[PDB]
Each structure stands twice: as structure tokens, then as C-alpha cells.
Nucleic acid binder design. Structure first.
Ligand code: 1RZ
Ligand code: 42E
Ligand code: CL
Ligand code: NA
Ligand code: NA
Ligand code: NA
Ligand code: NA
Ligand code: NA
Ligand code: NA
Length: 292
DNA sequence: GTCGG
DNA sequence: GCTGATGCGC
DNA sequence: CCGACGGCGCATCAGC
């Protein structure tokens, strides 16, 4: 948190590059600079000090210098105040609204959530769901709720066919105290690298018990949607949550599990998601999810 | 925007 | 209607 | 100096 001013500034610039400029490589450059500075154990005093870090070059060093002198960046102040650029950047916070859709909406005078609400006919299915749960989607999920969600998923999965194997992956599997979403990996002995309706049946059951509430996409191997825990008589509704379910062939299942458990950095220096009869087999060259 | 061949 | 391209999320 | 900078499932578009 020592350089939060700088990292905040670089993330804001990254967002403008991705959402407004449509310059994905600059978005990534700014994000990489932000992340190396975030983990730097000193409070940065000059652009020159920052440049020493991989991913910080001449232009970001110059911006760091301006920020340290003035607590702001003229360029960033100007883009913030720009009605068009700030509106485009904002609308991409809606799931399903990317840089192209945001630009098209803003060019039509649709600039706010309110405007989106009045214009349901101009939104596709995903965007309508993104708008409906805009606030809920930006919330994190407490571990306590993830456990309750896990409970429902594993119960209903076994109920459909006791031969399914399902594992909730992500930071949750590593024992984290909160998650952004629920990631479920599903397999079945019948499904292998060369092999009916295995995903649909699970999705249908989870809908039957009113756990899955909406669908963003559903193909033969991947479901993306929305779920919600049940409430009671006089306790406030749980937020709606993002849930993904991936059907993976049995012989590739445990590579997927390794992958989708992470962490990202752990995967990187353990280094694909596809190609084994357990997590231990791959470890070869064993660490449990807690210490990954 | 940064890096490196 | 078909097929390959594009947008999007992650 | 100048090209690399990620891959893939699904929804939907754009070109015939
Ligand atoms: N951007 C990323 C993030 C994760 N990973 C890999 C594959 S999924 C595995 C575990 O991801 P985590 O759940 O720790 O990261 P998330 O960003 O989903 O944290 P949550 O907000 O907890 O959900 O790490 C990646 O390759 N690229
Ligand atoms: P989500 O943020 O839940 O991430 C989980 C998995 O990580 C992989 N991933 C994340 C981000 C990006 N940009 N690319 C990517 O492959 C797949 S989903
Ligand atoms: Cl770019
Ligand atoms: Na551009
Ligand atoms: Na550097
Ligand atoms: Na979006
Ligand atoms: Na977004
Ligand atoms: Na996640
Ligand atoms: Na597909």
C-alpha cells in the first residue's frame, strides 16, 4: 500500500487504454507496471527509482515524476473530465459491454446506467443480465457463503449422477477468505479425450432447485450464469453471484483442477490446463492448495 | 508503453 | 442458410 | 529501429 497513489494512477490509465483507446498492449503495459510497483517494498521517491523495475520505462517514470510533484497527472485529469471518454470507460463495467459496445452506446447518447435501463431493446441478453446485477456483480463473496454454495452444488451434482466428480476451484480451494465468483469443474468417467448431455443435466438440476437464476452462455462444455443462495422469512436477500461450470474429459480433469486452482503466480513457475489420475501425478519434478 | 532481438 | 470473423469474458 | 505483447468457448455479426 506504500505506493497506492502511483498504482491507482497507472490502473486508471490502463483502463482508459483498454476501454477508450482500444490499445490492449498499452493496457497490459500499465497493468504490469502497476503490479511490479505494488509489490515493491519501498515508498518511491523518483521516476528514476521506479524505472529500475521491469515493466517501468521512460514514459511511466515521467508520469511518476509529475505525480510526485503535483499529486496529479494533467493528462489523467483531462481524460477524467472528458464526458465522452469517462462515459465509455464507465459503461464497460457492465458485464457484456466491452469497448466496442460502450463506444456505440455513448455515440448514441446512452452514457449512464439510467440510460441503459431506458434502452433495454438495444441490449443483448448478456448485457441485460449485466445491467440487472450491476451492483451484485461488483461484490465479493464471503468464504461462509461460498461453503454454502459449494454444499448445494456438490449435493445436486451427486443427486443427478453419483459418478460425477465436481470440484470448486479458484482461490476458494486454496482457502481464501473471499472469492469474486464460483468456478466449478465437472467430470464423469464416460467423458474422455474421445467420447451425452452431461453438462445440461447438472445445469437443469441446479435450476430446478432455484440455485441458478440466469444463463449468460451454455454450450456442450461450458456454462456461465448467475446463482443465488436461498434466504428465509426475515433475513435480507443474498446478492446474485457469478457461477461458471466447466465439463472436462476425465483424463484431463486433474490438469484442469491444478490450473483453475492456481494461484496465477504458482502456475507460472510450476511452468497447459489440459495435459494423470490426480494432482500429485503432475507434481512430478506435492503441495496442497493451501500452500500454493 | 516496454522490451529485446 | 452457411461459414468465418468479431466481441466479450476470463 | 521495429515487431511482440495469449488462448479459447460461446454469442452474435458480417459477408456471401
Ligand atoms: N487472471 C488470471 C487469474 C487466475 N489465473 C489462474 C487460472 S484460475 C487460477 C486460480 O485463480 P484465482 O481464483 O486465484 O484468481 P481470481 O482472479 O479468480 O481471484 P478471485 O477474485 O478470488 O476469483 O489461477 C490465470 O491464469 N489468470
Ligand atoms: P477469472 O478472473 O475468474 O479467472 C479465472 C480463470 O483464469 C483464466 N484467465 C483469467 C483472465 C484472463 N485474462 N485470461 C485467462 O485465461 C481463465 S478463467
Ligand atoms: Cl495496444
Ligand atoms: Na485506438
Ligand atoms: Na524498467
Ligand atoms: Na464489460
Ligand atoms: Na469491464
Ligand atoms: Na474468479
Ligand atoms: Na463452442
Amino acid at each position: 500500500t506504500l505506493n497506492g497513489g502511483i498504482t491507482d494512477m497507472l490502473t486508471e490509465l490502463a483502463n482508459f487504454e483498454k476501454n477508450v483507446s482500444q490499445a490492449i498492449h498499452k493496457y497490459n503495459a500499465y497493468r504490469k507496471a502497476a503490479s511490479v510497483i505494488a509489490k515493491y517494498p519501498h515508498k518511491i521517491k523518483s521516476g528514476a527509482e521506479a524505472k529500475k523495475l521491469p515493466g517501468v520505462g521512460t514514459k511511466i517514470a515521467e508520469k511518476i515524476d509529475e505525480f510526485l510533484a503535483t499529486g496529479k497527472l494533467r493528462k489523467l485529469e483531462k481524460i477524467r473530465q472528458d464526458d465522452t471518454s469517462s462515459s465509455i470507460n464507465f459503461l464497460t463495467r457492465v458485464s457484456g459491454i466491452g469497448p466496442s459496445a460502450a463506444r456505440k452506446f455513448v455515440d448514441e447518447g446512452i452514457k449512464t446506467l439510467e440510460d441503459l435501463r431506458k434502452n433495454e431493446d438495444k441490449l443483448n441478453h448478456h448485457q441485460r443480465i449485466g445491467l440487472k446485477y450491476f451492483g451484485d456483480f461488483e461484490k465479493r463473496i464471503p468464504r461462509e457463503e461460498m461453503l454454502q454454495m459449494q454444499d448445494i452444488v456438490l449435493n445436486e451434482v451427486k443427486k443427478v449422477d453419483s459418478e460425477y466428480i465436481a470440484t470448486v476451484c479458484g482461490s476458494f480451494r486454496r482457502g481464501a477468505e473471499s472469492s469474486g465468483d464460483m468456478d466449478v469443474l465437472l467430470t464423469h468417467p464416460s467423458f474422455t479425450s474421445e467420447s451425452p448431455k452431461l453438462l445440461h443435466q447438472v445445469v437443469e438440476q441446479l435450476q430446478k432447485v432455484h440455485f441458478i437464476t440466469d444463463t449468460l452462455s451454455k454450450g456442450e462444455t461450458k456454462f456461465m450464469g448467475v446463482c443465488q443462495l436461498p434466504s428465509k422469512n426475515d433475513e435480507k436477500e443474498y446478492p446474485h453471484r457469478r457461477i461458471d461450470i466447466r465439463l472436462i474429459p476425465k483424463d484431463q480433469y486433474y490438469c484442469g483442477v491444478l490450473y483453475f486452482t492456481g494461484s496465477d503466480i504458482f502456475n507460472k513457475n510450476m511452468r497447459n490446463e489440459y495435459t494423470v489420475d490426480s494432482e500429485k501425478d503432475i507434481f512430478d519434478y506435492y503441495r496442497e492448495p493451501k500452500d500454493r
